């Protein structure tokens, strides 16, 4: 009795790499001491491999336990590499580490938003969590506004978990995200946070005080840290009003230059380093303080060709030997997925059903009471153009 034909016998585009069929097991991922093998994991994930569910859970839970015991404003010193939004762009994350340096000898601070928008969010989480497990005192993760139940349920991260893993893995990620610190004080000179300032936050002690172990509420200091933006006219404002309602996000605030100046001066800080907004150049240096001649605010953005349409550079910020040097990098190829992770059966079946039925209806309509006598199937979907088109997805989802 002849065996089945070899799996890829009639495969049409043979040069396309085929993903592993087997999930990585615990024996493969964890050494004798219970320590994960980051290179084994990385190589598997780059090929679009998956891990056994218990391994995903183990990685997420251990990372969560380490994160949970950190302060809500951690303190980190230079030298360091500071990174902004990643947004599930795992293959760009790989490039980021090649540019920034290996975590085995390089200190890192990530400002949040590991998930959503990109379709490799879970891979980003597993890999960063493993790095956190291996280098708990040199690699640091902050919370972004997407690390929460509200946004991941509205965007695709919850569905991503359901499809690639399970709801158990999603629920584990939700607890892990609740444990992420909200801010970092870098070298006693820079406040690092995902979004920015709050009218209710005037000192570092206002941040240190926060109960971070929860879904971010719709308003208040925790919300603002994750959600706020500099005003569109930051540094050149008409009104001198410190804060105004953030019309872009649908919640939280715009903060202006006077608000930033006051905060820096009251806290003996040099600048605020944040993320949260896409930049064509991968970063933005805002208006310099009159006093110091140093940029009062910095935005860092680490997701190149964001949404595969922005065509923007990404950047990380390297702070070493008293120099802040911005390293830019471009996007990298990544594998294709259909919107919301749907398989091709789910995708094509409604069309098949519709077209075969239509054919038969037409065929049977050849008589009408005489008896009484391209190919029309598609997918499901400039910097300033991409921005305006994606404006609703920067706003907080209803309820």
């Amino acid at each position: 009795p002849p065996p089945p034909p070899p799996p890829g016998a009639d495969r049409v585009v043979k040069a396309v790499p085929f993903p592993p069929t087997h999930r990585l097991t615990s024996e493969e991922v964890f050494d004798l001491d219970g320590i994960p093998r980051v290179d084994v994991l990385k190589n598997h994930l780059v090929k679009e491999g998956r891990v056994d569910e218990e391994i995903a859970l183990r990685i997420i839970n251990e990372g969560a336990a380490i994160l949970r015991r950190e302060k809500t404003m951690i303190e980190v010193e230079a030298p360091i590499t500071v990174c902004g939004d990643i947004h599930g762009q795992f293959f760009d994350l790989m490039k980021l580490f090649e540019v920034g340096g290996s975590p085995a000898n390089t200190r890192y601070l990530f400002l949040g938003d590991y998930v959503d928008r990109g379709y490799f969010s879970i891979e980003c989480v597993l890999y960063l969590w493993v790095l956190k497990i291996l280098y708990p005192s040199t690699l640091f993760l902050l919370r972004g506004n997407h690390e929460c139940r509200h946004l991941t349920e509205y965007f695709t991260f919850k569905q991503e978990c359901k499809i690639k893993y399970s709801e158990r893995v999603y629920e584990a990620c939700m607890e892990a995200f609740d444990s992420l610190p909200l801010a970092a004080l870098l070298n006693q000179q820079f406040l690092c946070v995902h979004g920015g300032l709050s009218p209710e936050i005037h000192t570092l002690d206002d941040i240190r005080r926060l109960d971070r172990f929860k879904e971010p509420p719709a308003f208040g200091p925790m919300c603002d840290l994750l959600w706020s933006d500099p005003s569109e006219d930051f540094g050149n404002e008409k009104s001198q009003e410190h804060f105004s309602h953030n019309t872009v996000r649908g919640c939280s605030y715009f903060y202006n230059y006077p608000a930033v100046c006051e905060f820096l001066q009251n806290n003996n800080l040099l600048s605020i380093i944040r993320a949260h907004e896409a930049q064509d150049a991968g970063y933005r240096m805002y208006r310099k303080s009159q006093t110091t001649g140093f940029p009062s605010l910095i935005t860092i953005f680490s997701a190149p060709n964001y949404l595969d349409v922005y065509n923007n550079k990404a950047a990380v910020l390297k702070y070493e030997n008293n120099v802040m040097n911005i390293r830019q990098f471009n996007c990298s190829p990544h594998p294709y997925w259909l919107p919301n992770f749907m398989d091709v059966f789910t995708w094509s079946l409604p069309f098949v059903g519709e077209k075969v039925t239509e054919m038969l209806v037409n065929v049977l309509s050849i008589c009408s009471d005489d008896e009484l006598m391209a190919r029309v199937f598609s997918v499901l979907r400039s910097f300033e153009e991409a921005k305006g088109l994606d404006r609703i997805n920067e706003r907080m989802p209803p309820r």
Binding site: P4, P5, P6, P7, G8, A9, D10, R11, V12, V13, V16, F18, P19, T21, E48, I163, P335, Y336, W337, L338, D343, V344, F345, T346, W347, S348, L349, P350, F351, V352, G353, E354, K355, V356, T357, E358, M359, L360, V361, N362, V363, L364, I366, C367, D370, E371, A374, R375, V376, F377, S378, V379
Partner: protein, 166 residues
Amino acid sequence: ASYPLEMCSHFDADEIKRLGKRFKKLDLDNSGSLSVEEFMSLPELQQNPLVQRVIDIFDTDGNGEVDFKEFIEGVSQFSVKGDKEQKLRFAFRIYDMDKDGYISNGELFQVLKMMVGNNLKDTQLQQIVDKTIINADKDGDGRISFEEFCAVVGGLDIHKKMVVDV
């Protein structure tokens, strides 16, 4: 006085008679069989990318045409009296080109290609085909059985659309 035709279908005598009338009118040269060219002489079918797939499925004896028995049993798959599994199996058969009972990688690609055209790059299409198979293949032979097909799509209720009046 020819020999009776034998068939299996959901249709009563009146419905079979009405379908007989449609058959005759479709059979242009009156050969008792239905050629591809006779199907294609209906303008409304000319831009439908699944026509040949449907004809292949109807043509159970494989002589490239649809006789009256095959016509009746084909249309019966779309009877209001037909069950979920029946409609789903017909759908499965759209993808299962060589009729061996298993959707393969190459077939899933080709049939999708018929529908998608150039809306995706070949590389893109191969990648989503690859992942669909991996995710749905429960016994690891690289191809999709009818049981594995249903586990994926049985919740979609597309069967409720696959229905015609006769």
